[PDB]
Amino acid sequence: TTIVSVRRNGQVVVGGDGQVSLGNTVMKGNARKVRRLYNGKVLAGFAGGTADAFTLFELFERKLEMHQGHLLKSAVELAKDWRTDRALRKLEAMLIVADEKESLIITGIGDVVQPEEDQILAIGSGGNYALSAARALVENTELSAHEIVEKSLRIAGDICVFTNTNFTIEELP
Amino acid sequence: TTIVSVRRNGQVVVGGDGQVSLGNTVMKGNARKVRRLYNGKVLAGFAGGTADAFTLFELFERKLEMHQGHLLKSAVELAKDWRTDRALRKLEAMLIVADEKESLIITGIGDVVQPEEDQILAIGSGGNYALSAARALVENTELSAHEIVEKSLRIAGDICVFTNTNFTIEELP
Amino acid sequence: TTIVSVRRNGQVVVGGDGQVSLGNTVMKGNARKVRRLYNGKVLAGFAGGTADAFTLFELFERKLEMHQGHLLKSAVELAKDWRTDRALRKLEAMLIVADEKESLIITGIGDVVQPEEDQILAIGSGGNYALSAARALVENTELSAHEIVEKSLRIAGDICVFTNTNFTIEELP
Amino acid sequence: TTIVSVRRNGQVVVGGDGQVSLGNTVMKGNARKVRRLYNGKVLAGFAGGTADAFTLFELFERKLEMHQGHLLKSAVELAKDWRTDRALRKLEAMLIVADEKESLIITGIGDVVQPEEDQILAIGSGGNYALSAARALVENTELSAHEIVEKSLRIAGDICVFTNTNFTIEELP
Amino acid sequence: TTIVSVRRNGQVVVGGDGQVSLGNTVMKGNARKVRRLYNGKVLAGFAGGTADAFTLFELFERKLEMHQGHLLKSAVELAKDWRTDRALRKLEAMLIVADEKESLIITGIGDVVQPEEDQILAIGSGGNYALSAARALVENTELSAHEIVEKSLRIAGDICVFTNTNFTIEELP
Amino acid sequence: TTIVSVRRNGQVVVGGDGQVSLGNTVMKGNARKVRRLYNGKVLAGFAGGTADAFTLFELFERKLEMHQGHLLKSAVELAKDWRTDRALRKLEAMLIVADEKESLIITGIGDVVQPEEDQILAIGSGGNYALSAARALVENTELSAHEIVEKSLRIAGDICVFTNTNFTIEELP
Amino acid sequence: TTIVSVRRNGQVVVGGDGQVSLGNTVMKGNARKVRRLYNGKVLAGFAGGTADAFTLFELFERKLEMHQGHLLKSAVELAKDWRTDRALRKLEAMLIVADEKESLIITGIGDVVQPEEDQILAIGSGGNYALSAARALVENTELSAHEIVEKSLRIAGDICVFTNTNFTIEELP
Amino acid sequence: TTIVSVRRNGQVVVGGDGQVSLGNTVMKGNARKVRRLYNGKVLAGFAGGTADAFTLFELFERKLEMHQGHLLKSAVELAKDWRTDRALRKLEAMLIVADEKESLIITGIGDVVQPEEDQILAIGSGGNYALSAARALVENTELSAHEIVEKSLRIAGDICVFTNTNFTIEELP
Amino acid sequence: TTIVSVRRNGQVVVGGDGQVSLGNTVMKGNARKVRRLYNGKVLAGFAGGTADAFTLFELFERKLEMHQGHLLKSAVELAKDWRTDRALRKLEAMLIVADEKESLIITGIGDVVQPEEDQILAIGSGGNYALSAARALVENTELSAHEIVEKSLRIAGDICVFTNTNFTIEELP
Amino acid sequence: TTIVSVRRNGQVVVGGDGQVSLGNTVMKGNARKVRRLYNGKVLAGFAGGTADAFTLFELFERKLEMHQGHLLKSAVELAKDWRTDRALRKLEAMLIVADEKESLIITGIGDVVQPEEDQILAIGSGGNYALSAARALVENTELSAHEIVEKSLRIAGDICVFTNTNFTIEELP
Amino acid sequence: TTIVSVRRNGQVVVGGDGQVSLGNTVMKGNARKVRRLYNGKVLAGFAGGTADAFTLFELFERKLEMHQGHLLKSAVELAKDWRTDRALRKLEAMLIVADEKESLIITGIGDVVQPEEDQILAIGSGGNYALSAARALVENTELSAHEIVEKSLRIAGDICVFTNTNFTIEELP
Ligand code: NA
Ligand code: NA
Ligand code: NA
Ligand code: NA
Ligand code: NA
Ligand code: NA
Ligand code: NA
Ligand code: NA
Ligand code: NA
Ligand code: NA
Ligand code: NA
C-alpha cells in the first residue's frame, strides 16, 4: 500500500493506491483508501483493514467533534486511546490525516507525527518511494500538490509489488 | 479448501469443496462448507474448522438480528469483534457471506473485502484458482453464476492438492 | 513471473509477463521472457534469471542440433545434464519449450512434463492462475490459442504480485 | 505418489497413480508411472522425475541384457552404480521392478529391497496407505492381484494429497 | 549503499554515496563506490563488500578484454561465472556497469538487467529511493544526467540509514 | 536512538536525538525523546517505541504519586509491574529517569541501574558511544553537564546509523 | 556474574562481583549483589536483576518471619511460590542464602540445593570458576572462608567475561 | 579486542588491549597486539589470531621492502593479495598500520581504509567505544596522542566485555 | 538422573544416583533422590527438583493417610490433583513409588503407570540404561533385587552424562 | 538400528537387528546390517543408510588391502578420508568393525573408538540399551559372546522403536 | 574433555581425562588424550577426535623435524596450515603442546596461545574448571606441577559432565 500527502500553494492532497493483498496475491484492486471526514473538511488515508479504519475514523470523528475541529489535539487524544485501550491496541492500521491547517501521521505504536518543512507525508510499504519522488518534484518543479501526488503514487506503484496504480485522490479545498 | 461466489443476472451463488486435511492427508472428503443463514436469506461459506465456523456464524446471525439484516454493517461489526475479542482472536478462518444485495469476505485481521465490479469472491488455499477461472468465464461467456461456480471449483480442485471435487453449492433466490 | 502456453487449431503460442523482482520490489517491468530458438522453429519461455536462461537455451539448441530437432529427446537430454552437472545444478529456473509437434516443461529436478489433453502448460509464481484461466477458456470458448494466452496472462497479472501486465507473446507457425 | 505391487496366484501387478506435484499444486494428473521393460517381461514403477526414470531404466535395461534377464543380479548392479557414480547419486527417484520370478524395490540410498512373505511392495508418499489396504485385502479376501492393486491405489489416493485416482496398472503375465 | 545511473542526451553518469557500515555503525564515510574500468571507457559501481566488488571488477575487465569490449556479452559471461564458481558464489554484491552504448545491473543470482525506457538503474539498500527520485526528475524536468544523479543520491541518503551524502560521481565522456 | 544523562555540579541533564527509524529507513528526524514529568520535577528519556514509552511514563508518574515522589522506590515498583504484567511485558523499551537527587535506568527485564561514580547513564543503540564520549569529557575537561550531553550525543550520532544530530536536551533546575 | 559462598571454622562468607551486562557490554561495574537480611542474620547473594532480587528477598524475609527463621524451611517455601506463582514465574534469577546454621541455593525451577561436604556454593555465569578455585583452596590450604571467597572471585573474574573484579563480600558472624 | 590509533602534534600512537577470548571466557589476558615492523618505522596492531597476524605481517614486510617503505602502496598490494589468494582469504584478522606519514586500516573484506580529518582509527569489538572517547578528547582537550590512546583504551575496556585493561602502546617517533 | 526399582523374591528396592545438573555442569553430586514415606512402608524416588518433590510427597502422604495406605488408589488421586491444579501442573518431577504390594511410576503428564511382568521400573535420563541392565540381570541371573539395582545404576551412570555413581538405595522389607 | 559386538574367550561376534525405517514407519524388517568383509576375515556392521554403509565398506576393504589387513591402521585411514572427502562427508553412518585381534567403532567425525576392558561396542539408536545389557551379562554371567549379543539385541529391540527383533549375527572364527 | 598443563620448578606436566562422548552419553571412558612426541621430548594433549589428533600430531612432528625442534615456530607453521588447507580445515580440535622450553595452545582458527606468567594452559569443555583450580593451587601452595595437574583434573571432572576422572598424565623430564 502507498498513501502520500503533499501540501503546496494553499492546497493539500491525500492519495492512495487500491491494492489489498493477502500474502503474495491480490484480493482487491480498486479499494478506496482515502476518505473525507468531518463533513468534508478532513482528508484521511489509511493503510490497514477496512474494519480497523472504520473503527479508528469513527473514534477520530468523535474527537474532532469534541475538540472543535482541532486536528492536532484530536489526533493526540486518538493516539492516547489507541495505545491505552486493549481492544484498540489490536488495530494495526496506519493513518494520515490532513485539514486546511496541518497534516499528520497517526499510528498505534508511534502516536502522532508531524511533517518536516517538506509538508510531505507517506505511509505504507510503498511510502518511501512516493516520498522520494514527491521530494524530488517539490524541490525541482512548480507542479501542484495534486500533480505531485498522482505522479509519486505512480512511481511507487511501479516499484512496490504491494501497491498498484488505481488511485483515489482527494484535495482541499 | 476452495470457496467461490459469483453473482450474475439476479442470482448469487456460493460454492465450496469438501476436503478437510491434516498435514498432507485427508481427514474428510465430504465436508459441507457452505450453509444458509438468517432464515435462508444469507449464504455463508467458510475456510477453517467446523467449530470455529459455528461460533462465527452464530455471532454473525446475532449481528444480522440487531442490525436489521444489513450485511455490510453486520460484517463490519463481526470483524471488529473478531479482531479484538481475546476468545475470537484464537479462531483462524476466512468467511464469504452473500445476500440478495451484496457479497463480502470477512477476515479476522480487521478487514471486510468487497468484490471488484465482476462480483466474484473466493477464499481458501485454492481460492485464487477458482477466482482465475471465474473471471475468465464471467468476462468471456454467458454462463450462469451457478455454472461458473461449478466449473471454477472443479478447475481449482484439479490444481490445489488441498481442495477436492465434492461440492456443496447454494444459490439465492 | 507467469509463462503460459496453449496449442489450439494448429497454432501454438507461448507468452509471458515482464516483471523481474528483487524481494518485494520491481527491478524491471519489461523483460522479454519468451524467445524463438532453432531457426525460429522452437518457442521457449523461462522463469528465472536472464543469464541462467541464456546458458540453458544455448545448451538446448546444441541438443536440438545433435538430436535431429526432436523436442522430447532434446528436452530429456537437457534435463539429465541440468540435473547432474555441477555447474548447471546451480541454475534455478523452469522452462517451457514448444514446437509444431508438442510442448514441454523442463525442470532442473530431473523432470520433463507433458501437458494434459488440453495442451496447456504454465510455469512461474503466477503460472497456476494463468493455467486456471486457460483451462476455463479452452473448455468453454472457441477463442484462439493467442487470445487465450493473452487473457490468461492478464488474469494472472491481476492476481500474482510478482507478475505484471507487459507481455511478450510468440506464435508458431 | 503411490506405486504398489502385489503378487498372487501366479500373477504380479504393478500400479501407480498419475499425479505430478510441485509444492502444493498439481502440474499433471495423467502421468504414467508404470512401464514395461525388457520386451514386456519386466514391470517397472517409479516415484520421481521422468528424466531420472528414463536414465535409471535405460541403465537397468543394459544390466538385464548382460545378466540374462536375472532381476536380482541386475538390480544389485544397478544399485551399485547408483551409489558410486557422482552423476547417478543426484537421481532421487525410487523404483519398484517385478518379473515372473520376483519383485524388488530399488533406491539410490537404500540399495535393493525384497518383500516379506506378503509379496506386497509400495513406494511413494502414499505407499504405506496402499500397503495397509493391500495387506488387509490379501489376508482377508480371495481378490486377484489386479483387484487388490486397483482397490489399494484408490484407498491411498483418497487419503494422500499427493496421490490421485488416475491409475496405470500393468500385469504379468 | 546507494548507486544510481542515468543516461540522458549523450551523457552517462554513475554515482554512489560513500558510507561503509559495520553492523549498525558507520565505519567510513568517504568510500569510492564508482570506478572507471577498461582504460576509462567503462563506469562501474557496486553495492556490497569492497574486496568482493574489486574481485568482480577485475574479472569483468578480463571479460571485456575477451569479448572485444562488448558490455552485454561480457556482463552475461561474468554473471555465468559468478553463478557457478565455488569462490565467486561466496561474493555478496550487486553491480552497475555502463559504457557509451548501454548500462546494466549484474547480479550473482543469474540475472543481467537492462533499464527501462527511462534509462535509469539503481542498486543498494537505498537504490529504490534514488530510483524513485531519478524517475521523477527524468520525466518532469530537463535536468542533466549528472544533476539528476546528485539530487537522487541526496534524496536516498536522507532516507536510507546506510547511505550518506558524500558522493563519487563519474561520467562518460 | 541515543539518550544520555550527565549530572555535574548541581546540574542534571538528559538529552536524546530525534531520529525515528522504520526498518532501515528514517521515518522522522525531529522526535522528542526526553520529556519533563511529575510537575516538571523529573526528566525522562526513552529508547524504543513512542507509544510504549508514553504508556510507561504515565505509569511511572502514578508510581511517583504513590510513593511520595521518591525516584528509586518508584522505579523499582515500575520495574516490577513491567516485568510481570501481561500487557506491559509486550512493551519494548529502556528508560532513563532523573530528578534533583538521583538518576536511573529502568528496564523491562527486572533491572533498575544506578550510574557509577561519574554519574553518567546512557541507553539506546548509540548509548555506549555517547557513554564513552561522556566519560572522556567528565574525566578530562571542566565542561558543564549540558555541554557534555550535547557533545556526546553528536559523537554518538556520527557513529550509530539510528541516531541523528537533532537533539532535545532537558535540564534540572 | 559470580556469587560464591564458603563456610569455614565457624565463619560463613558470601561474595559477589559487580558487573551488570547488557548483551556484550557493561551497564554497571559496581553493583552490590550480596546483602544482609533478617536483622543482619542472613546473607543473601543473587544472580539476576536488581528489581527481581528485591521482590524475591522481600518474600524470603516474609517466609523467615512466619517460619521462625528456619532457613531450609523458608527456602523451600520460597521455591514453591517462585515455581508456581504466575508473577514470580517471570523472575529469572538464582539465589544463595546463608545463616549461622547452613547455606542454600534457591532456584525458580523447583529446586533448593544444599552444598557438598566442603560447604561451598556458587551461582552465576562465572560460578563454576569460583567453585573450582574454592574447592582447590579448601582442600589444599588453611585459608579463611573470607580469603577463599576473595581469591575465588578474582580467579572467576579473570576468566568469565561477564564477571568483573569489584567485589562485595559479607561475613557472618 | 580494541586497537586504536591517534596522530597528534607530529606523533602517532597505536595501542591495544590484551584479551584473547574463546566464546565467553578468557584464554589470555596479556597478549601483545601491537608490534613494530620495518625496523621500527611502522606500528602495526591487529585484531585476530597470532598465526594470522604472523602471516599477514611477514607478507606486509615483504611489500614494504619492495615499495621502498611506502605505506599506502604496500597496503594496497597487501589487500590485493589478501582477497585474491585462496589461502589468504581464510585469514579474518583486521589490521591497523601507521608510519610517520599516514595511518591505515586493512582488512581482507574491506581492503584499505584511510582516516578522516580526525586521524583516529580503531578496530575490534571495542573499537567504536575507543573511537568515541578519542574523538571527544581530540576535539576538547590538548592531550597528547599517547594520553588519548591510553584513556580511550581504558574507556573501551570498561564497556566491552571482550576488551581488557592490560595495554600495549607504541609511539612514533 | 537415574532412578530404578526392582522387585524380586519378596523384596522391593528403589535406588537412585546423586547428580544434580544445571546445563552441562554439576551443582551437586551427593543428592539423595530416594526417601521413605508413610512411616517407612513406602519407598519413593524422584527425578526433579527437591521443592517439587517435597510438595508432591507431602501431598502423596495426605492421600495415603486417607486411603488407608492403598498405593494405587493414592497414586491415582495424586495424579488427578497433579493435572487439575494449575499450581501442581507447574511441577515437572517424575516419581517412582513402591510398597510391599506394588510399584508404580507417577508423572504430571502421564498419570499412573504400572510395571509389566518384569516388576522393573525406571525414570530419568539414564532410566532406560538401568532398565536394560536390570532386565538382563533379572532374566539371566539369580541376583537379589538389591544387587540388580546397584549394578544397573552403575551401568547407567557409566553411560549417561547426567547420572553419577553415588547411589542411595532403599529396600523393603 | 542397534549393532552390538562382544569378544569373549576367543570368540568375536557382531550382531544387528533388521529394521529399516523411513520416517516413523517400518519400511523393511529383515535387513542384513552385519557383513563379512576382506575374504571373510572381518565383521562389519553399520548404523545409517545402506548405500552409505556399502560405500564405506568397499573403501574400508581397499584400506585393508593397502595396509596389510591391519584393522586399526585401516580404520584410522578410512576415518581420515571420511572426515575430509567432499562426497564422503555427505555419508551419515557409524560403523563397527572387528577381526580376530581387535574391534573398533569408526565415525565420520574424526573418531576411531576402541572398547573398554569389557571388549564390548555398540552403535545405533538402540546401541546404548544393548551396551547396558551386554555389560551386565559379561560382568555377571558366563554366557558366550554369541548369546550375549542375541540377548542384548533383544533387550534393545524391546525399548528402541527403530530396532526390531530379527537379527543377523556373525562370528569369528 | 579436559586437558591441563602446568610447568613448575623445572618440570612440565600435561594431563587429560578419558571421556569420549556422543551427545549426552559416553562412548568410551578410558581414552588416552595425552601422548609424547618427537622422540619423547614433546608432550601433546588434544581435545577432539582420535583420527583428527593423529593427523595433526603427525603434521606437527614433520614441522618439528624441518624447524630444528623449535616449538613456537613449529606451532605457528602448523596453525597456518590448519587454518588454510582445505582438508585440515575440516578438523575440529584444540591442542596443547609442551617441551622443556615452553608450552602452547594451537587452534584451527589461526591462533597460537602462550600462557600467562603462571605457565598454566587448559583446553576442552572442562578446561576452565581445571584452569581455575590450577591457578588457585599455583598461587597458594607449593604443590608440584604433577600434583596440581592431578588435583585440577579431578576438580574439573566433578563439575563438567563431559570430563571424567580417568586420567593420563605425562611429565617432562
Ligand atoms: Na506495484
Ligand atoms: Na485437489
Ligand atoms: Na501483478
Ligand atoms: Na489424493
Ligand atoms: Na542516510
Ligand atoms: Na547517525
Ligand atoms: Na571478567
Ligand atoms: Na572489558
Ligand atoms: Na555419568
Ligand atoms: Na523396537
Ligand atoms: Na564429569
From Swiss-Prot, chains A, B, C, D, E, F, G, H, I, J, K:
Q: Tell me which residues this entry annotates as catalytic.
A: T1
Its primary localisation, in coarse terms, equals cytoplasm
Keyword set includes Cytoplasm: yes
Q: EC number(s) in its UniProt entry?
A: 3.4.25.2
List UniProt keywords, sorted A-Z: Allosteric enzyme, Cytoplasm, Hydrolase, Metal-binding, Protease, Sodium, Threonine protease
- Any GO molecular function: threonine-type endopeptidase activity
GO BP: proteolysis involved in protein catabolic process
Q: Which GO terms describe its cellular component?
A: cytoplasm; HslUV protease complex; proteasome core complex
Q: Any idea where this protein resides?
A: Cytoplasm
Q: Which reaction does it catalyse?
A: ATP-dependent cleavage of peptide bonds with broad specificity
UniProt-annotated binding residues for Na(+): G157, C160, T163
- InterPro entries with a match to the protein in the record: ATP-dep_Prtase_HsIV_su, Ntn_hydrolases_N, Proteasome_sua/b, Proteasome_suB-type
- Quaternary organization: A double ring-shaped homohexamer of HslV is capped on each side by a ring-shaped HslU homohexamer. The assembly of the HslU/HslV complex is dependent on binding of ATP.
Write out the similarity annotation. Answer: Belongs to the peptidase T1B family. HslV subfamily.
NCBIfam families of this UniProt entry?
A: ATP_dep_HslV (TIGR03692), PRK05456.1 (NF003964)
- What's the name of the protein? ATP-dependent protease subunit HslV
Species of origin:
Haemophilus influenzae (strain ATCC 51907 / DSM 11121 / KW20 / Rd)
The gene name reads hslV
